Design an enzyme around this catalytic site. Structure first.
Site, PDB file in Angstrom:
ATOM      1  CG  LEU A  47      -1.982  -1.033   1.371  1.00  0.00           C
ATOM      2  CD1 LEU A  47      -2.708  -0.867   2.704  1.00  0.00           C
ATOM      3  CD2 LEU A  47      -2.963  -0.895   0.195  1.00  0.00           C
ATOM      4  CG  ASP A  48       1.373   3.791  -3.292  1.00  0.00           C
ATOM      5  OD1 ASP A  48       2.431   3.133  -3.395  1.00  0.00           O
ATOM      6  OD2 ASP A  48       0.611   4.009  -4.258  1.00  0.00           O
ATOM      7  N   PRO A  49       2.346   5.058   0.788  1.00  0.00           N
ATOM      8  CG  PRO A  49       4.445   6.064   0.793  1.00  0.00           C
ATOM      9  CD  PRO A  49       3.448   5.398  -0.132  1.00  0.00           C
TER      10      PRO A  49
END
Ligand SMILES: [K+]
Ligand SMILES: [K+]
Ligand SMILES: [Zn+2]
Lengths: 304, 55
Positions: free
Chosen positions: A64-66
């Protein structure tokens, strides 16, 4: 429901029910479904889990992205071996998209239908469901169920273009990944407390509530349940022979990936079916499964 | 800037400040910020312990 090929007894002196493992073994073959915070990377999160539980190894699943929050399964120790199976089931997200120019609710619904099914991205990905949850002017909140690997940021852009304008993803939250759902997710603070409660108060209750057995993340696979006498051999590299099978799922097709389990429900390994359910049921000899990865430690069950 | 919300009761996602299916004020879905420092961990755990040997 499974089809019984041969009724067999299991020896409770070896292994155990995955949900009844001693605490150390629950951790050894466990998975923590973290509700990822906005800000850190997925790697920072797996690192934190690793430090919190004082582990030597840990790994997360679908990155999952930041800025994305939500379901982030983190396999612990031996469970990291099972991560490759997690991408199989579909994923689900709730997403907030911001259109550059307002569009009618009817046009959005129409385009959602247009995107439902196969689409292309840089790959062909399947969009199973696309539901309009809410809308306020150019702000569109929707739920999307899709194949792993689907880029939601790109999906928002293409939907914007399909509407005659443009759009960008504002927020994203994953609600389902693999066999895990938001209801399974736990805050890192609660995982930390669970550990402390075990190490100090000597209470395993919280840890047992937040750590799930890796078998929980493999429920989407058809099964081949083997006799006790075949387990250790399989752990040492043996394939699964017809005569070692006690029960199996209906509809197993040749070439299909299947989970090899013990009579107690413990995940032993995964592999490719060499025979279909019926052939296995009718056969008296032969190799049923070509084992590709072993999950259980050697010596858990008796060597024969 | 709009932000997604979620009903604490029904668990439904919406942009509304008040759930349309239940009633309670909706909340931001984001998990509380975390740090290994675990600043208020002692107090948080203190509460859980007390609350537990009660209800
Ligand atoms: K995953
Ligand atoms: K607007
Ligand atoms: Zn509600």
């Amino acid at each position: 429901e499974l089809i019984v090929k041969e009724e067999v007894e299991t020896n409770w002196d070896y292994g155990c029910n995955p949900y009844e493992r001693k605490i150390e073994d629950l951790i050894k073959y466990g998975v923590v479904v973290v509700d990822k915070p906005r800000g850190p990377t997925s790697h920072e999160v797996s690192t934190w889990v690793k430090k919190i539980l004082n582990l030597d190894k840990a790994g997360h699943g679908g990155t999952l992205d930041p800025k994305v929050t939500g379901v982030l399964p983190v396999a612990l120790e031996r469970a990291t071996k099972t991560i490759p199976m997690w991408h199989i089931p579909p994923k689900e997200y709730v997403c907030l998209m911001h259109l550059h120019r307002d569009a009618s609710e009817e046009d959005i619904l129409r385009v959602f239908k247009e995107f439902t099914g196969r689409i292309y991205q840089r790959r062909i990905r399947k969009i199973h469901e696309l539901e309009l949850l809410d809308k306020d002017g150019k702000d569109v909140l929707f739920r999307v169920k899709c194949q792993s690997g689907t880029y939601i940021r790109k999906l928002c852009e293409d939907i914007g273009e399909a509407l005659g304008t443009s759009a960008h993803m504002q927020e994203l939250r994953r609600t389902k990944s693999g066999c895990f759902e938001e209801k399974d997710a736990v805050y890192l603070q609660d995982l930390l407390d669970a550990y402390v409660f075990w190490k100090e108060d000597g209470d395993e209750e919280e840890l047992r509530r937040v750590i799930k057995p890796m078998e929980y993340g493999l429920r989407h696979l058809k099964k081949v349940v083997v006799k006790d006498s075949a387990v250790d051999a399989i752990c040492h590299g043996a394939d699964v022979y017809v005569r070692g099978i006690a029960k199996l799922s209906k509809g197993i097709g040749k070439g299909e990936t299947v989970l090899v389990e013990t009579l107690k429900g413990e995940a032993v390994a995964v592999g490719k079916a060499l025979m279909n359910t019926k052939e296995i049921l009718n056969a008296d000899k032969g190799v049923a499964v070509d084992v590709e990865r072993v999950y259980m430690d050697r010596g858990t069950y008796p060597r024969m | 800037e709009m932000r997604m919300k979620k009903c604490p009761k029904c668990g439904l996602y919406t942009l509304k400040e008040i759930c349309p299916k239940c009633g309670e004020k909706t909340v931001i879905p984001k998990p509380p910020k975390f740090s290994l420092e675990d600043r208020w961990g002692k107090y948080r755990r203190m509460l859980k312990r007390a609350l537990k040997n009660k209800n």
